Write a protein that binds this ligand. Sequence first.
Ligand SMILES: CCCc1ccc(S(N)(=O)=O)cc1
Length: 126
Amino acid sequence: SVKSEYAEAAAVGQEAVAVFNTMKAAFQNGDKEAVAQYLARLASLYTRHEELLNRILEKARREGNKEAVTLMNEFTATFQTGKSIFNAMVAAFKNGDDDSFESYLQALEKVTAKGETLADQIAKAL
Ligand SMILES: CCCc1ccc(S(N)(=O)=O)cc1
């Protein structure tokens, strides 16, 4: 069901949460070889989450679940803000700009610790 597909997408999101926090620790410790691998892992995880979210949105639209569509449209937009910041963080790493990496990292935590409520609402709407 769309609801179980969202829980699957939810767990995939939690996987990025865990990998991000161990990446943050590695960055602080200066373990750039670890950071690089974690950033690659995160890119895969964020791509996967987005693909699952698109499928769920398309399914809610086919189902005519107007409230779920509204929430998912808002959530997908928020996801994209996160992704743009993530990609900027990756570029900061390639460039060796630790000051921008720190900024982008802290912005991305704010984007995710703000969209949490909406993510929980969607579970209850589908
Ligand atoms: C690239 C990060 C995109 C992103 C992932 C997860 C959430 S949350 N805490 O489920 O609202 C928001 C943005």
